[PDB]
Design a protein around this ligand. Structure first.
Ligand SMILES: [Ca+2]
Ligand SMILES: [Ca+2]
Ligand SMILES: [Ca+2]
Length: 87
């Protein structure tokens, strides 16, 4: 599908064991779908990203190509996605 890459920081990078993670998602995959692909690649991330209700924790900052992105936004091949824990 569409290949793209996540950058992870601080404890998220530590849990994943890498500062970068490649993912490959569907053509109409959202940012949220790309985030679920990241967590599928490194399931230990799950409880550092989502609460028991499945919702993103408050204050996590998801970027797509350097701009804040909501989980329903589109993705595209070559995207640079970033996941920062709360400031
Ligand atoms: Ca797309
Ligand atoms: Ca519980
Ligand atoms: Ca770039």
């Amino acid at each position: 599908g569409a290949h793209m890459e996540w950058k992870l920081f601080a404890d998220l990078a530590e849990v994943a064991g890498s500062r970068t993670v490649r993912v490959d998602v569907d053509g109409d995959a959202t940012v949220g779908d790309a985030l679920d692909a990241l967590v599928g690649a490194h399931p230990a991330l799950e409880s550092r990203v989502f609460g028991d209700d499945g919702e993103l924790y408050d204050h996590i900052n998801v970027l797509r190509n350097g701009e804040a992105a909501a989980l329903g936004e589109a993705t595209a091949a070559g995207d640079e996605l970033a996941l920062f824990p709360p400031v």
